[PDB]
Design an enzyme around this catalytic site. Structure first.
Site: not given
Ligand SMILES: Cc1ncc(COP(=O)(O)O)c(CN[C@H](CCC(=O)O)C(=O)O)c1O
Ligand SMILES: Cc1ncc(COP(=O)(O)O)c(CN[C@H](CCC(=O)O)C(=O)O)c1O
Lengths: 396, 396
Positions: A130, A211, A246
């Site tokens: 990510w 994570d 999610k």
């Molecule tokens: C591995 C991973 N960690 C942390 C998060 C963060 O979650 P939260 O929104 O509760 O803070 C995401 C959200 N996946 C993103 C969503 C949009 C973004 O924030 O980029 C995605 O991979 O599209 C994720 O895929």
């Protein structure tokens, strides 16, 4: 003073939503940000959630500040979900959980905490991963290194390269692992591989940081937690940043948790007080709504049964779409084999498209994906599947 | 890795909340945390708020991510309240507002924004001030310097000690200002004094950072922004961190805003892009519930009217308690004059009590106040007034 500031580029993921909402050509398809959509192409609020929100509307009598670490029940419920109801970590009280503003918020307090209260100097993240992972840790002054992960040839986990890559990860170094549904590959380690890693981790002396943003999107709540639980059974200390964005469809309410685990209650309590200090210097205390909804659902068996069903339905539609995606690609004339998609877990799929091709789909066919070729399968529907596959085929 | 972490001391303000909740005495009185209480000693949810929440429950269709800088209407609404509807700043599009998790969160993003993108090295905070101010800035890497402000001998503002103190503030330095209802003294500068500091500000070349958490608790919405407005009319750049915790009774929903002001529309937009980067690496995007409530109330004239009425009622109840507090102290035999308390603005009052006296009130009488002698007048009611004053007189 603000003249000397250099503009920052757009976020490779969130920037997407801006461009999408901008171009006016009809038929455009959004496969960017990782949000779930039902067969109609909408991201609805779960029923269990609407239920919990009405309960809150009727029984809430004050918005008085929560404690720095949030709602007590929220903390308890997350630990059960992570380690299991009868878990030893809980019984011995080796874990403390702070309610945070989303999974991102949990990674940031974990970073601030480590930078300011330990000798941690480096965090190892998977390549790819990510995008925001590096930004979060760098914001705390932590150096971020990458380790090998994806076999771009076999479309599998390059376990040998991963092991070799982490040979230089020192004792005291933090190693980041995705609980399940690796973003963006969708390829997770097998239980045997997790066990090998857990063992390797203890021997090398790494501080594991998990994570966990998609628990329940791979196989199931308990199953998706197997890797993490294999580590917790062998590790003295570990950190887990989890998100409810999610699995509860509560994206904008920012519900997450940072769970800290130490050798014994006395140590975890002491270190946790420093984590609370880090939180106090950031946002002071967490937003109540989202977390209250979650604690309400997890605490009531009727709502809990409902939610579990809704989660099951989301997971299933995603898998159904994965098969439909592969079949239609063939139907529309793709010569490249996309069977590997069926083996990937979660919302995403690493398509294999190049930055050039992803850019063509956007500007030429109005189909939006992240520049790394990641495409959100949860965004595909029976209605856009054909137009979508016809676009991809035209660019191959 | 967590073995040698030294425990952190409790927060001087949030820590007391824990002690109070735990205190077994049935007659205990809470005058610590800056939270409003109505005549019955409760912290209710405003009716304007409850109605907005009802609308949200029946009309919200998605919980989809809320953009890095949050709800657009929210940002616009906070700019009018801060600068006035027909402001040149708004017209010249020189201001950009980010929705943040509370005033604290707004203060942290400003700090992160400055430490990561500018040359700023030190922040100037009044002596005294909110204890968490130093913690927020030290965390972002900035050094904190204090300037004189209070005349304990006359319970008044020491304008000469103040200006004589800020003489040591070099150009490029940031100076923290409380919009109104200074915490913990309750003594604010007069418009005249605001004019002076403003001109002195531009001359000495400082970046003014306003902490605006009590708009509407001194005199009125427009009136309390006068000082800020005088600054906005002269400066090219400035930062304002506001909060809706108090004037909307939304403490635990974490609703705040960080507003950036620059010389022109081009510069501010370029600078705001880095602020979004700072936000993205912290909590990614803001919690929607609290912010949505404010947006829907400030956008609906009918709700707006209800809210302003409730705010007026909170402000007047506090003034009534202020007067009652001074009259009752004498009635109970106070060996001094607390007349100055009538001259203080906001929720607090710098009692003059010593730390030893404050400890005594808590331990022997179960009356909780901040160790600095700060007392929350908004926490006083017709019922606890007598017991409360009897306790103070006993420690005098
Ligand atoms: C591995 C991973 N960690 C942390 C998060 C963060 O979650 P939260 O929104 O509760 O803070 C995401 C959200 N996946 C993103 C969503 C949009 C973004 O924030 O980029 C995605 O991979 O599209 C994720 O895929
Ligand atoms: C000057 C000042 N700045 C910022 C804040 C932050 O508010 P928010 O909760 O939106 O982040 C407060 C709240 N006044 C505190 C409340 C409790 C605390 O956080 O210490 C008080 O002085 O009692 C405040 O008085």
């Amino acid at each position: 003073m603000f003249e000397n500031i250099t503009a920052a580029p757009a976020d490779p993921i969130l920037g997407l939503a801006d461009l999408f909402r901008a171009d006016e050509r009809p038929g455009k398809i959004n496969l960017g940000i990782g949000v779930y959509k039902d067969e109609t192409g909408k991201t609805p609020v779960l029923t269990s959630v609407k239920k919990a929100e009405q309960y809150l509307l009727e029984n809430e009598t004050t918005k008085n500040y929560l404690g720095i670490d949030g709602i007590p029940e929220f903390g308890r419920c997350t630990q059960e979900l992570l380690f299991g109801k009868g878990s030893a970590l809980i019984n011995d009280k080796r874990a403390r959980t702070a309610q945070t503003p989303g999974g991102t918020g949990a990674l940031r307090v974990a970073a601030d905490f480590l930078a300011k209260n330990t000798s941690v100097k480096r965090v190892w993240v998977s390549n790819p991963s990510w995008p925001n992972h590096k930004s979060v840790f760098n914001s705390a002054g932590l150096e971020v290194r990458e380790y090998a992960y994806y076999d771009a040839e076999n479309h599998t986990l390059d376990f040998d390269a991963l092991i070799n890559s982490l040979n230089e990860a020192q004792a005291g170094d933090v190693v980041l692992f995705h609980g399940c549904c690796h973003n963006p590959t969708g390829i997770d380690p097998t239980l045997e591989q997790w066990q090998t890693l857990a063992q390797l981790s203890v021997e090398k002396g790494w501080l594991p940081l998990f994570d966990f943003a998609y628990q329940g999107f791979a196989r199931g709540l308990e199953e998706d937690a197997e890797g993490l639980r294999a580590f917790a059974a062998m590790h003295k200390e570990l950190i887990v940043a989890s998100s409810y964005s999610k699995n509860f469809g509560l994206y904008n309410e920012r519900v997450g948790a940072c769970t800290l685990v130490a050798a014994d209650s006395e140590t975890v309590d002491r270190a946790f007080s420093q984590m609370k200090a880090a939180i106090r210097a950031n946002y002071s205390n967490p937003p109540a709504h989202g977390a209250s909804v979650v604690a309400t659902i997890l605490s009531n068996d009727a709502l809990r049964a409902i939610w579990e069903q809704e989660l099951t339905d989301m997971r299933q539609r995603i898998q159904r779409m994965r098969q439909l995606f592969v079949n239609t690609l063939q139907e529309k004339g793709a010569n490249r084999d996309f069977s590997f998609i069926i083996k990937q877990n979660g919302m995403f799929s690493f398509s294999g498209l190049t930055k050039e091709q992803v850019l063509r789909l956007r500007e030429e066919f109005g189909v939006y994906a992240v520049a790394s070729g990641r495409v959100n399968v949860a965004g595909m529907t029976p209605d856009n599947m054909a137009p979508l596959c016809e676009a991809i085929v035209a660019v191959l």
